[PDB]
Design an enzyme around this catalytic site. Structure first.
Site, short mmCIF file in Angstrom:
data_model
loop_
_atom_site.label_atom_id
_atom_site.label_comp_id
_atom_site.label_asym_id
_atom_site.label_seq_id
_atom_site.Cartn_x
_atom_site.Cartn_y
_atom_site.Cartn_z
N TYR A 38 0.89 -1.14 0.02
CA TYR A 38 0.40 -0.02 -0.13
C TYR A 38 1.18 1.20 0.22
CZ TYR A 38 -3.75 -3.01 1.08
OH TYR A 38 -4.79 -4.22 0.73
N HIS A 40 -1.96 1.29 -2.77
CA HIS A 40 -1.36 0.68 -4.30
C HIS A 40 -2.85 0.89 -5.56
CE1 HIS A 40 -3.71 -3.35 -3.05
NE2 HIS A 40 -4.69 -2.57 -3.90
N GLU A 58 -5.23 3.10 -3.43
CA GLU A 58 -6.41 2.72 -2.69
C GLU A 58 -5.17 2.47 -0.89
OE1 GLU A 58 -7.34 -1.54 -1.47
OE2 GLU A 58 -7.54 -1.97 -3.51
N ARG A 77 -10.74 1.22 3.68
CA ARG A 77 -9.41 1.98 3.02
C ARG A 77 -9.93 3.37 2.35
NH1 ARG A 77 -7.83 -2.17 3.99
NH2 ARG A 77 -7.56 -4.27 3.27
N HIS A 92 -14.35 -3.42 2.97
CA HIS A 92 -14.18 -5.27 2.94
C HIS A 92 -15.83 -5.75 4.24
CE1 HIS A 92 -11.72 -5.57 -0.45
NE2 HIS A 92 -10.77 -5.87 0.30
N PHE A 100 -15.57 -5.12 -2.28
CA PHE A 100 -16.02 -3.57 -1.53
C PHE A 100 -16.88 -3.03 -1.69
CE2 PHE A 100 -11.01 -3.30 -2.18
CZ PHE A 100 -10.88 -2.98 -0.98
#
Ligand code: 2GP
Ligand code: SR
Length: 104
Positions: A38, A40, A58, A77, A92, A100
């Site tokens: 992250y 990414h 994110e 996120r 999630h 998501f």
């Protein structure tokens, strides 16, 4: 009240801005943290209608209030673009598999 509710996690706009700032800085420096690397690219397979333009990236936002620095990213996120604009907050939690849903 929560500005963003991700399942049971409560975030304020300031929490989102703090997370976003950290994620954008790493993006700009070309560095990543964590096993999932992250921040990414966020492809938006979900097809969310963000008001800001892509590309999207994110970065984890933590319920502890701390900035992500490695370890478990949790389910939430923040999504930002190349112009460091906030697209939205997603999770999630409540979504099947690795999909998501947006935090409301
Ligand atoms: N669900 C979902 N996963 C994405 C998207 N963009 C990238 N991913 C990544 O695609 C793979 C399958 O979902 C995962 O590695 C996931 O990374 P994260 O797990 O870090 O989100 C997106 O738009 N939606
Ligand atoms: Sr907070």
């Amino acid at each position: 009240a929560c500005d963003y509710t991700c399942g049971s996690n409560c975030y304020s706009s300031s929490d989102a801005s703090t997370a976003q700032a950290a994620g954008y800085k790493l993006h700009e420096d070309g560095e990543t943290v964590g096993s999932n690397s992250y921040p990414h690219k966020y492809n938006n397979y979900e097809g969310f209608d963000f008001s800001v333009s892509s590309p999207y990236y994110e970065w984890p936002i933590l319920s502890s209030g701390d900035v992500y620095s490695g370890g478990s990213p949790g389910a939430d996120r923040v999504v930002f673009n190349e112009n460091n604009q906030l697209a939205g907050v997603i999770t999630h939690t409540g979504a099947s598999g690795n999909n998501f849903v947006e935090c409301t």
